[PDB]
Ligand SMILES: CC[C@H](C)[C@H](N)C(=O)O
């Protein structure tokens with residue numbers, strides 16, 4: 161006998177360039193928590209249903225997990241874009257959802273069954289602008305790019321634009337693209353002609369990486385900030401040596417000294433031979449929230465005896481009240497499921513000259 165927890169993440173499509181890191185973190189969590197006896201001796205079982213890259217696939221995944229797999233709760237989906245369309249399905253069904261990495265404004269407000277462990281763009285994004293200004297105090301002109309078809313990219317760009325204004329900088333252009341675009345020559349040239357000192361990009365991984373590369377090819381020599389959708393070593397293959405120097409805010413640090421982070425980090429490094437990425441840590445934290453909430457609930461009200469609809473509702477109620485020492489730090493939730501947490505960082509992509517390898521270097 162095991163307790164089923166659904167994992168609805170992008171395991172296929174270009175969205176999997178983000179989702180696969182989340183999957184990795186979830187699998188590390190499953191082993192970590194089951195090796196500690198699961199839920200008071202009862203193992204958890206993570207049930208993976210691929211969402212693919214769109215809304216319909218996410219709705220399908222959620223419905224399968226809820227109806228066929230009888231899960232007590234869902235971790236997912238990967239994108240804010242998917243969450244806005246699919247999370248209402250879980251809300252209506254009274255099945256908890258914990259989002260690992262979805263940072264658009266408005267997600268916890270979807271309903272009483274929607275929580276997230278990832279602080280939103282309003283507190284994440286400004287960090288990287290401040291870091292850019294620290295590295296070059298003479299930045300004056302800023303060009304902003306965003307993926308107009310993606311909910312998170314639109315939410316993130318709003319924050320970047322406001323931060324640029326609040327820092328007293330000149331916003332010389334805002335250029336739009338689609339996450340499915342590979343070619344950005346016109347937008348990149350448009351921006352380059354305005355002589356920006358800083359370029360900010362809010363897209364996802366393949367698109368963001370291609371845009372970074374093309375900006376450099378077209379002769380742009382200024383600073384570049386990537387938003388959260390570029391926050392993966394999967395961009396390295398796309399921009400190669402030309403990824404070097406990109407600044408990306410972080411909501412997780414491998415060097416955070418919490419005991420569970422040490423365990424998580426060591427498990428990750430030993431397997432993948434590099435530091436755990438943010439998305440992996442976030443997915444681990446989401447699974448942790450479910451395991452620790454299930455343990456707390458089970459101690460007060462034995463879960464093996466609770467029928468599924470009531471188990472889902474009681475689990476949701478419990479998780480919202482919990483305090484968790486996770487790889488992300490100590491976190492908890494507001495009454496509507498927003499994360500309460502502290503500490504952000506900024507990292508900078510450092511590529512080897514040949515462009516075949518790189519790393520994220522955390523700024524001190
Ligand atoms: C994988 C998460 C992505 C990068 C973004 N934070 C979003 O909310 O969609």
Ligand SMILES: [Cl-]
Pocket residue numbers: 340341342343344
């Ligand atoms: Cl294109």
Ligand SMILES: [Mg+2]
Pocket residue numbers: 267268269270271272273274275496497498
């Ligand atoms: Mg909520």
